[PDB]
Structure 1
Amino acid sequence: LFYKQHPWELSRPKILVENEIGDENYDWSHMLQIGRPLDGESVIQRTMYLIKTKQYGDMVEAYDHARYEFYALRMQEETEQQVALEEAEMFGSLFGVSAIEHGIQK
């Protein structure tokens, strides 16, 4: 469902190579976790925690609640990257080729 609703989340590369499954100490009371990316799986695990703690009864309601938490985190990252680029150019950072330029050359 998540990737049907958000097709472009597929375009974010995923690494299937595991590090150590036994080291994962995650507290799914919050979506962000140290050691793993923010992605669709973050939403699914958050939804399961909500239904497991019985905060929400219907899976749809827990899923929607997790989705909004995911949108908030995605918006804060989209701004941190835009602003970081803008701030660097304002202090004299120079870049050889942009993504748009790379595509034109190819």
Structure 2
Amino acid sequence: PYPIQHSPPNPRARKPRNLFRPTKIVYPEDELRRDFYRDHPWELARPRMIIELDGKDARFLDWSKGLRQRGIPLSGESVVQRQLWLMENQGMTKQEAYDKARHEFYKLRQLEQMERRIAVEEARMVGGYFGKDLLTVGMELENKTYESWKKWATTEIARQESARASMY
């Protein structure tokens, strides 16, 4: 059949091809997501779960309130949806809506990082001890890997030395 056209077909084409080929799905968000995540590349290191629980996650999303929503974490997507809302409902420009929503994203992330530091600090004031921090653990693993490199280097180094005796 004639597949669904997700974008206006080229009106200039006189002899169009691939009429029975499904078209690409492009939304207005795609453009915004690309812009934001390019301005915040390290926002991709924040793990994001794409495993739907029941699919009823878009029923409690009201972007008129703010970035924080029920069921979804605070991520770049919330900024884009919030941006799109302001741009459409409040008749804002792409840049204007981008600035407002983006700035709210920062303040929410700042408190999150402040809690971690104040949490561990205050916890020790009353006799609270924790495990190995991620920094220490990371360094330990490098030791085990660096030592393995030393062995390989020593062997190959000796190999070349023995291989150099044959040149003469």
- Following TM superposition, the consecutive aligned residue runs of length 4 or more in structure 1 with deviations greater than 2 angstroms are 20-24
What letter corresponds to residue 9 of structure 1 in structure 2?
E
* Deviation, structure 1 residue 13: 0.6
Larger relative helix fraction: 1
User: Does residue 1:102 correspond to 2:137, yes or no?
Assistant: yes
Where 1:21 maps in the other structure, the secondary structure is coil
Q: State whether residues 79 and 101 of structure 2, in contact with CA within 8 Å, keep that contact through their aligned partners in structure 1.
A: yes
Matches within 5 A, 1:4-19: 4-19=38-53
User: Does residue 1:72 correspond to 2:107, yes or no?
Assistant: yes
* Deviation, structure 1 residue 60: 1.4
d(CA) in 2 for partners of 1:21, 1:73:
26
Matches within 5 A, 1:37-52: 37-52=73-88
Q: Which has the larger radius of gyration?
A: 2
Flag structure 2 segments of 5+ consecutive residues without an equivalent.
1-34, 142-168
Instruction: Tell me the residue number matched to 1:28.
Output: 63
Aligned identity (percent) is 45
* Deviation, structure 1 residue 72: 0.9
| Higher RCO, Cα 8 Å, sep 6+ | 1
What letter corresponds to residue 39 of structure 1 in structure 2?
S
Q: State whether residues 62 and 69 of structure 2, in contact with CA within 8 Å, keep that contact through their aligned partners in structure 1.
A: yes
Flag structure 1 segments of 5+ consecutive residues without an equivalent.
none
TM-score calculated relative to the size of structure 2: 0.59
Q: State whether residues 57 and 71 of structure 2, in contact with CA within 8 Å, keep that contact through their aligned partners in structure 1.
A: no
Instruction: Tell me the residue number matched to 2:89.
Output: 53
d(CA) in 1 for partners of 2:126, 2:95:
47
Question: Structure 1 pair 23/99, CA: closer, same or farther in 2 (3 Å)?
Answer: closer
